[PDB]
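hiii so my PI (J.) wants the whole complex modelled not just the main chain, which honestly fair. so below is everything: three entries, each one labled with what it is. i double checked the lines twice but i was tired so who knows lol
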Amino acid sequence: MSFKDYIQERSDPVEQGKPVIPAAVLAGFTGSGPIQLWQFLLELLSDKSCQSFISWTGDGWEFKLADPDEVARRWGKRKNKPKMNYEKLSRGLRYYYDKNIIHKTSGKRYVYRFVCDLQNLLGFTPEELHAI
DNA sequence: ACCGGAAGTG
DNA sequence: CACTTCCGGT
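here's the output for the full assembly
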């Protein structure tokens, strides 16, 4: 059962102004518990009003933190960690490397790649998601 | 910027 | 476990 299948259970599978993949729902789906960093990044990447500071690149699930500081600010906010910065947030991303959640794109600045089979998990292909 | 150990929070 | 905080090194 994908996430796309999961959201059908909601009264509003996609609320008007809200993102397509809220981290809370995704946490509820995965059953992880509190919001995780890789889930928060998807929420922003599925939010049109966040395109400016974070956005998908061309191929697959590669994304770029255009403005790392604004991402780290919203991450601190969501986590109630006032002193959050990219230096610490990115250290959270490096812990995903050996866990195969996210990987660093070698050579590109602030560019990362989801590597946890998002096609199967979300139910959306890269192209289908990147339409919205 | 990016890395990954160490240790602390919860 | 999942970071958060800090660090010397690349």
